Design a protein around this nucleic acid. Structure first.
Ligand SMILES: [Mg+2]
Ligand SMILES: [Mg+2]
Ligand SMILES: [Mg+2]
Ligand SMILES: [Mg+2]
Ligand SMILES: [Mg+2]
Ligand SMILES: [Mg+2]
Ligand SMILES: [Mg+2]
Ligand SMILES: [Mg+2]
Ligand SMILES: [Mg+2]
Ligand SMILES: [Mg+2]
Ligand SMILES: [Mg+2]
Ligand SMILES: [Mg+2]
Ligand SMILES: [Zn+2]
Lengths: 86, 96, 107, 116, 122, 45, 136, 23, 97
RNA sequence: AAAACUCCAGUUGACACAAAAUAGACUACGAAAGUGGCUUUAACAUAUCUGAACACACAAUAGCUAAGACCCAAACUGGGAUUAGAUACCCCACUAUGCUUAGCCCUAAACCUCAACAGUUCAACAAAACUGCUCGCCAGAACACUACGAGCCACAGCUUAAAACUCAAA
């Protein structure tokens, strides 16, 4: 309100692709976690539930990143069977 | 007996990795470096996974950013447009 | 209450002190310093006034003089900041801890 | 870099409150979750809009707005063929990475070992 | 202790700026300060519209007063700055170059937690 | 060493007798605390 | 060459749109609620030029909270902005309702040209407490 | 565990609060 | 007679030190389609893609040069008590000879 | 959807005694409760350990007394929907209350249901199995966070806390 009115969250259209610009805008807001904040602050989340949610998301982040290290570490051994008839 | 191994602390030990700001003094008046660790569009302080700062430095940059923005040194909702030109050190990728 | 014009313990043995300008005297005095430093001096003054060798810092008498200084400081705090329940616990625990060390020296 | 799990859980010897409260034991499964379906789309809405505009601006007469009508029909045909193409595409190959079944085959060849 | 005063003053001319800098520094020494230095970070646009003393300010002149003061003088200095109508924003902090920098050996690597669950079959 | 370093520094302190001249000198000077870091740990002033 | 970042008001900027710089192009404001989308076109000096919304264009209750309603409202607002002489427009959206891009598409179909998209959706830094969660 | 013992004590407490209000 | 400590000290996989970025000659010993199963000494074999340039000068027995990044390639994951070995080492094929 | 508002809505500018995006993928401080906007001042007991349910000091939320503040939220209440009914769930409005000051009240699934200090490497589920020492507690279910007595700024309260009848299990 007290800042400069048209710098924050502003994307410029190129050639006339307004679709390549809105998608970009939604992507910065998603990457900075603005969109999920709006969705989570439509209704008040009581602090007990805040702690429970923000613990479930952190456990999900830990587990997801571990299966991703395992999927990448073993996608090399998805090569053709070296000894076909054993 | 002469060719049996010997107790020593590990050679070929690489020196520990150091942070981009290790040994430098973070100050709240340094709105040029603080702005580097903020987001160009929303002004959001970046996390460790983007900055790559040690815990000491992520804490000093966060505290200096908050001090400068409440003191009248830094914009809150954007990166001062004068600094969308300095050396990028953050592992983020908005455009595609 | 040591006078505001007194000098810090770490600095009270520097050979050039009486010749220095009055601004430097004010700058390393106790006026332009904090309360934790008055307590260091009150613990070494009280030190010189009570104990034998003021250079032990590992004895019952020495530990009682140290706890007694924190107790005045916890008391001086609880007089302006009255509703500070955390520092009221420290004082009452410390009054209790002085009383214990006191007993073991009495005995 | 994965977030650490050093003193986050309620364990014996930990001098802290638990940072995390996992409802399942934090051990990697031998399985990968199945691929989620795509959701509702509401396609051809814009062209349908341009078609229905002509109708109300022209007493609901087709011969009045053949081109807008044709736009609606061709968007419908392209939407149906996009549905068929997308079905056969998601059956053929997942974009970039691999199918959940084949990844489960890989994870079945190098299983997790939570025991001794 | 040693303090730094970050002072955003009004966008003014040289005689008025010298007058208000003199006023603030005399207020400091009247409160009992030994002033170390005056710095001019310079006149620049404000990051946001700071409204102070019934005016809406868009630009301002940034100055630093490095000084030493007694522990019981910062509050009176803050009150004086709050009543000055040429000061846009004055803030007194402990001076950064009185906290010594610790040596950092480096980023000590953290391993993967172990012995978090039992080795039962399950 | 601390006392001697402080002695040499007090000669350049602002006093009542130094105030107007030092105010004008500050008004003519400018200090810049701004500096940027690179991906390598090197300052780009 | 191309920049996603906009021109800083006080600087040289070679970019123009029919003579006007970035700072005098009129602004369309799209408030996208969960039940309505409202588009108002104003000049750079805040002179109202066009205002349309789903309730204005005829959708009465829950059909207002649709993309087609915001498209129709955008077409109407673009029409009135054309009769006030507007070609180029900078778009600011406030909200996360159904008809955000739908209102943008309605403006482009009506015949206005978008050069910048801004998002002024209100996010408190923990101000007022919102409603209780619904037991839906 | 279930909450059946808690349920019995909950119903006991409710009937008491109703008697004290009533009497 | 040489003791095993002597055998080890004076051996070329004990004079190599840290395997990372050490150039090593190896011999292709199996080919599947375009995956060349090479050796280089060591306990494990490395598997490399067929270099399309000179892509017929890589046959069974050809001596090649490899960069070497690892000698066993393993890692422990979330619930694991031991490591997940891929029973293969990691190297980058630079060329022939 | 209706009811409601139209003293309404959008842009802009002035403007808080309320609440503290991001950082926070960090795991810190505190005895516990609790603590994550900025600045300053004061300040985080004990150079064995355990130990007060005959004490002293605290203790989320809710609540009481008195005087203030008011954006928002909201028990109660009223209106509108729903339903067989709907004293609910859904919508709208508004109060006690949440805030500050002063005093109470002294309770939580106050639980990480895992005691302090010192040390080591298998019933089932869960968060692997133990040793020394000390304190606290516990001994079928229900009656029973009950009765009675005592104490207490509590008076629809809190702590402590039975028995009779019944059952052959819980
Ligand atoms: Mg569970
Ligand atoms: Mg009506
Ligand atoms: Mg407050
Ligand atoms: Mg004890
Ligand atoms: Mg007790
Ligand atoms: Mg309300
Ligand atoms: Mg009220
Ligand atoms: Mg209480
Ligand atoms: Mg218990
Ligand atoms: Mg105990
Ligand atoms: Mg009870
Ligand atoms: Mg009772
Ligand atoms: Zn570092």
């Amino acid at each position: 309100a007290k800042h400069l009115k048209f710098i924050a969250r502003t994307v410029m259209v190129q050639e006339g692709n307004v679709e390549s610009a809105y998608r970009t805008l939604n992507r910065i807001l998603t990457m900075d976690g603005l969109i999920e904040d709006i969705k989570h602050r439509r209704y008040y989340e009581k602090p007990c539930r805040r702690r429970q949610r923000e613990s479930y998301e952190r456990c999900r982040r830990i587990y997801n990143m571990e299966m991703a290290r395992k999927i990448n570490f073993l996608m090399r051994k998805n090569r053709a069977d070296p000894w076909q008839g054993c | 007996n002469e060719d049996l191994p010997i107790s020593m602390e590990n050679p070929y030990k690489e020196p520990l990795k150091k942070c981009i700001l290790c040994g430098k003094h973070v100050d709240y008046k340094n709105v040029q470096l603080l702005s580097q660790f903020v987001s160009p569009f929303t002004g959001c302080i970046y996390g460790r996974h983007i900055t790559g700062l040690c815990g000491k430095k992520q804490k000093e940059i966060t505290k200096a950013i908050k001090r400068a923005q409440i003191m009248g040194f830094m914009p809150v909702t954007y990166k001062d447009p004068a600094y969308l030109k300095d050396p990028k050190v953050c592992n983020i990728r908005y455009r595609e | 209450d040591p006078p505001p014009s007194t000098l810090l313990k770490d600095y009270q043995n520097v050979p050039g002190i009486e010749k220095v300008d009055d601004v430097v005297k004010r700058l390393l005095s106790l006026e332009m310093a904090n309360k934790k430093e008055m307590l260091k001096i009150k613990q070494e003054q009280f030190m010189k006034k009570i104990v034998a060798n003021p250079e032990d810092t590992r004895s019952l008498e020495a530990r009682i003089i140290a706890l007694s200084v924190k107790i005045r400081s916890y008391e001086e705090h609880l007089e302006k900041h009255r509703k500070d329940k955390a520092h009221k616990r420290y004082l009452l625990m410390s009054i209790d801890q002085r009383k214990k060390m006191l007993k073991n020296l009495r005995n | 870099a994965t977030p650490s799990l050093r003193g986050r859980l309620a364990r014996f010897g930990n001098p802290r409150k638990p940072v995390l409260k996992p409802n399942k034991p934090l051990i990697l499964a031998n399985r990968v979750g199945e691929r989620r379906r795509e959701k509702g789309e509401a396609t051809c809405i814009t062209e349908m809009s341009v078609m229905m505009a002509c109708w109300k601006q022209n007493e609901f007469r087709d011969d009045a707005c053949r081109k807008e009508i044709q736009g609606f029909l061709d968007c419908a045909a392209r939407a149906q063929e996009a549905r068929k193409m997308r079905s056969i595409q998601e059956t053929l190959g997942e974009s970039g990475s691999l199918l959940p079944n084949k990844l489960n085959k890989l994870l079945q060849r190098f299983p997790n070992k939570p025991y001794l | 202790p040693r303090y730094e005063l970050a002072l955003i003053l009004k966008a003014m001319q040289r005689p008025e700026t010298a007058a208000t800098l003199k006023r603030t520094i005399e207020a400091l020494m009247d409160r009992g300060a030994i002033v170390r230095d005056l710095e001019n970070l310079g006149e620049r646009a404000l990051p946001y519209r700071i409204s102070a003393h019934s005016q809406q300010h868009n630009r301002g002149g940034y100055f630093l007063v490095d000084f030493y003061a007694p522990t019981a003088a910062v509050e009176s200095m803050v009150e004086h700055l709050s009543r000055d109508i040429d000061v846009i924003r004055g803030n007194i902090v402990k001076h950064p170059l009185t906290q010594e920098l610790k040596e950092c050996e480096g980023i000590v690597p953290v391993p993967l937690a172990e012995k978090l669950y039992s080795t039962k079959k399950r | 060493r601390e006392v001697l370093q402080l002695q040499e520094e007090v000669k350049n302190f602002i006093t009542r007798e130094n105030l107007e001249a030092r105010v004008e000198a500050a008004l003519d000077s400018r200090k810049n605390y701004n500096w940027a870091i690179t991906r390598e740990g090197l300052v780009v002033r | 060459k191309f920049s996603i970042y906009p021109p800083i008001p006080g600087e040289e900027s070679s970019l123009r749109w029919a003579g006007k710089k970035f700072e005098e192009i009129p602004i369309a404001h799209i408030k996208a609620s969960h039940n309505n989308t409202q588009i108002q076109v104003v000049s750079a000096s805040n002179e109202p030029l066009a205002f349309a919304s789903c309730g204005t264009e005829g959708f009465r209750n829950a059909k207002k909270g649709t993309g087609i309603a915001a498209q129709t409202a955008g077409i109407a607002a673009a029409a009135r902005a054309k009769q006030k002489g507007v070609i180029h427009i900078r778009v600011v959206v406030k909200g996360l309702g159904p008809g955000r891009l739908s209102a943008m598409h309605g403006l482009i179909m009506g015949g206005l040209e978008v050069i910048s998209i801004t998002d002024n959706t209100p996010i408190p830094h923990n101000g007022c407490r919102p409603r209780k969660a619904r037991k839906l | 565990k279930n909450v059946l013992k808690i349920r019995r004590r909950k119903m006991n407490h409710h009937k008491y609060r109703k008697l004290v209000k009533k009497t | 007679v040489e003791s095993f400590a002597s055998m080890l000290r004076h051996s070329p996989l004990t004079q190599m030190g840290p395997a990372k970025d050490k150039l090593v000659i190896g011999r292709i010993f199996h080919i599947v389609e375009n995956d060349l199963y090479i050796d280089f000494g060591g306990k494990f074999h490395c598997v490399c893609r067929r270099p399309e340039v000179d892509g017929e000068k890589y046959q069974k027995g050809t001596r090649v040069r490899l960069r070497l990044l690892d000698l066993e390639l393993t890692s422990r994951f979330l619930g694991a008590t031991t490591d997940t070995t891929v029973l293969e080492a990691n190297a980058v094929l630079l060329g022939i000879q």
